[PDB]
């Protein structure tokens, strides 16, 4: 919430202003950048279900 | 010496990161032998400690 | 003001579960649909929930039975 | 000529901003001996004896 969740930042700020104190976390952007980096080599890495 | 201390702490933390108390009682009868630490004519650690 | 949470810890002894119990009680008393069962002394919901746990009238089982009762009511 | 001279004077490891707190810091900085530099010894290459 505090660093990389682009939607999480706005959602948590909106909750704080409203007075909800709820998190609703997500996926940090840094992991997406790392995945794109590793995929930019000849290596495949994916988030399976 | 701070660099050596930091490297050692990093290695210890990583080698022991994934250890968690996940059970109430294993029920094993095994154990280790506890005796006060003696060395020549001097005592370092009594059994109580 | 709960400076120390020892009694609340001993009421439900894990030091980890009471965090979740107080979190859910504070959600009930803050989001809505609930009122404190202890006199409110201009305190935040967190310490009100902690005091309720300390007094012995809040725990996971009764929270679950109240949730079931409200679910069946509607 | 100008490029080399100005590159040495303006951008070098052994030509740094002088301290201006007190006259003592200026005096100390002016007569300062450094082991680093272009032809010197780097920080991590330094043993316990140097």
């Amino acid at each position: 919430v505090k660093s990389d969740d682009v939607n999480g930042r706005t959602k948590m700020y909106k909750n704080i202003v409203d007075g909800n104190h709820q998190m609703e976390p997500g996926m940090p952007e840094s992991f997406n950048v790392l995945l794109k980096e590793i995929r930019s080599l000849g290596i495949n890495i994916e988030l399976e279900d | 010496k701070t660099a050596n201390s930091g490297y050692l702490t990093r290695r210890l933390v990583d080698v022991a990161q994934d250890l968690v108390v996940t059970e109430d009682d294993c029920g094993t009868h095994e154990g280790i032998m506890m005796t006060p630490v003696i060395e020549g004519g001097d005592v370092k650690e009594p059994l109580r400690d | 003001a709960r400076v120390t949470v020892q009694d609340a810890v001993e009421k439900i002894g894990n030091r980890f579960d009471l965090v979740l119990v107080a979190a859910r009680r504070a959600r009930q008393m803050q989001v809505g649909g609930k009122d404190p069962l202890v006199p409110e002394e201009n305190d935040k919901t967190t310490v009100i929930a902690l005091r309720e746990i300390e007094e012995g009238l809040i725990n996971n089982q009764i929270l679950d039975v109240r949730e079931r009762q409200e679910q069946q009511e509607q | 000529i100008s490029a080399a001279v100005k590159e040495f004077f303006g951008s070098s490891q052994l030509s740094q901003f002088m301290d201006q707190n007190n006259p003592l810091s200026e005096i100390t900085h002016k007569r300062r001996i450094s082991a680093l530099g272009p032809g010197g010894l780097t920080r991590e290459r330094a043993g316990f004896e140097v």
Partner: protein, 50 residues
């Protein structure tokens, strides 16, 4: 910095783990390529130019 000239060293005599002390000689010019002489643990004269 180190003055140009000739320096003889013994590298503390702990390299081959046999207790044999190794002597080396270095010639350092102000500008140019270094020249070096070294002792093998089999007592052979070896140079390390540049």
């Amino acid at each position: 910095h180190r003055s140009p000239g000739v320096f003889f060293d013994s590298d503390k005599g702990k390299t081959h783990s046999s207790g044999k002390v190794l002597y080396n000689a270095r010639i350092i010019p102000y500008r140019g390529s270094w020249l070096d002489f070294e002792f093998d643990p089999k007592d052979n004269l070896f140079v390390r130019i540049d």
